[PDB]
Design a protein around this ligand. Sequence first.
Ligand SMILES: [Ca+2]
Lengths: 46, 221
Amino acid sequence: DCACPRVLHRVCGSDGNTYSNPCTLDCAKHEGKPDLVQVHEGPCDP
Amino acid sequence: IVGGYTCGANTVPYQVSLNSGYHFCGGSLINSQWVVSAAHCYKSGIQVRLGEDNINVVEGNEQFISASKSIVHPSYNSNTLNNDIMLIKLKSAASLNVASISLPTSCASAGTQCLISGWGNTKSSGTSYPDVLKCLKAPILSDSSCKSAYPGQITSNMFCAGYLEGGKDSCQGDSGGPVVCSGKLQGIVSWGSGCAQKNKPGVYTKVCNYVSWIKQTIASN
Ligand SMILES: [Ca+2]
């Protein structure tokens, strides 16, 4: 890990970054952002 | 595709984009009615988009065809991504020549140079989603090096392709997409640890293991 499928399913992190899929979100959370959470599906607003 | 290059229009005629409102996976046309893709690419209401280069601009000659059936491999494991293969049937047959890619009769060996394609992210660091189809020449990597890169995560239905050195890889958005080597669809973009990372090559579905099932599934659907 943090091993993610290579599907594009853009989500929005609580850090306001768009993640390419829930899994890469999950990875960023597990790598350096414990409080990182998915806010909603689709890209974040900039 | 990170570290790749622009395929060119129509140069990957079997490359399809799976679209459910936005591009989300690739796929390979294997005959006019059928697409292979990753089973993790499964969605309801897939629209298959054929003859795409710029996914963002309707050139006017593409074919947008709804998936009529989307058949995941019945051993597909979403947790391990073993058997990450899905057959999509087109509501109507694609207009050819768009073209299908041959299925393997043999597996490819370590060292085989392949063509991997997709509209997935082109950046390791940030995000850069391309508009035109991107391509990557990459060799199939040895099993032992695949497995040492990904201990406990590699099954006989997986192979690694790319570069241990990093920098050249498939990426999110590339899933379902082709790895074609010597004129044969050998791989489906499946997964990896990030994209284009040192010692984390792309992991692909080993299509050669699924030729009998693809044939049985196509013949019976
Ligand atoms: Ca287009």
